[PDB]
Write a protein that binds this ligand. Structure first.
Ligand code: CL
Ligand code: CL
Ligand code: ZN
Length: 265
């Protein structure tokens, strides 16, 4: 029997996929997680004990972003092998895919939290290879189910590209994306490109430099917006400023503010 339900903070969440917690953890009805340290437990009683004992009120690592009550924590999988191992076991419940939980050292994880008087509550995250051969700025990304479709996912994407901009480099997420992933990326890419086309003869490589979005990713977005033509084996941006505004006017809640970022490579 696999883990099929978890309790974390005040949420219970049914599982979507196999996650390889140790066998005897699968045995139990629920898995219980501390929402701050992400320790997993077998019973409500050991859960309750831990709750009144645990001193953590936030993720470990560095708070590299604070706007209002939104915070992002940078955790090095080398500094905190266990927390990150726990994070990955948690994420694998909802990511079909994921392939890596135990080897976490090569990764750095970014934890989105929304803060109240009690502490900083994890909402989603994205991991990132410290050194990427394939140029992926986002190894795995996810918003916890009860928080999905509210702009947190798109906030994370925005954020992963802000880091790329500060590294003066372009990146794409590692594939395959989930269907929610595809949608969110295509939506983010669209918004960013349309917003910029509103404000005169930019090349695709120019757009690529400004946004840190790869050329393939810009091209494929522009195709779906119907704003690129094919000429002699070359993708050519064909934009009518009345179809930019036209697309914008058509049908995120939370956005990355470069000022409130506290980072450097
Ligand atoms: Cl659920
Ligand atoms: Cl305990
Ligand atoms: Zn804890």
């Amino acid at each position: 029997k696999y883990v099929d339900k978890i309790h974390i903070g005040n949420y219970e969440i049914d599982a979507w996929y196999f996650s390889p917690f140790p066998e005897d953890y699968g045995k139990q009805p629920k898995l219980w997680l501390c929402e701050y340290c992400l320790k997993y437990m077998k019973y409500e009683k050991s859960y309750r004990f831990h709750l009144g004992q645990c001193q953590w009120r936030q993720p470990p690592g560095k708070e590299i972003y604070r706007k209002s009550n939104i915070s992002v924590y940078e955790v090095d999988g080398k500094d905190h092998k266990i927390y990150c191992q726990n994070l990955c076991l948690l994420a694998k419940l909802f990511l079909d895919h994921k392939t890596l939980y135990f080897d976490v050292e090569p990764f750095v994880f970014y934890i989105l939290t929304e803060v109240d008087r009690q502490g900083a509550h994890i909402v989603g995250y994205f991991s990132k290879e410290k050194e990427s051969p394939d140029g992926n700025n986002v190894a795995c990304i996810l918003t916890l189910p009860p928080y999905q479709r509210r702009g947190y996912g798109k906030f994370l994407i925005a954020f992963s590209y802000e880091l790329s901009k500060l590294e003066s480099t372009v990146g794409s997420p590692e594939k395959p994306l989930s269907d929610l992933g595809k949608l969110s990326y295509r939506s983010y890419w669209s918004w960013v490109l349309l917003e910029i086309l509103r404000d005169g003869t930019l090349s695709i490589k120019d757009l690529s430099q400004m946004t840190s979005i790869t050329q393939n990713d810009i091209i494929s977005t522009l195709q779906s917006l119907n704003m690129v033509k094919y000429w002699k084996g070359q993708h050519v941006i064909c934009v009518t400023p009345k179809l930019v505004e036209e697309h914008l006017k058509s049908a995120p809640p939370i956005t990355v503010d470069s000022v409130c970022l506290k980072w450097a490579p």
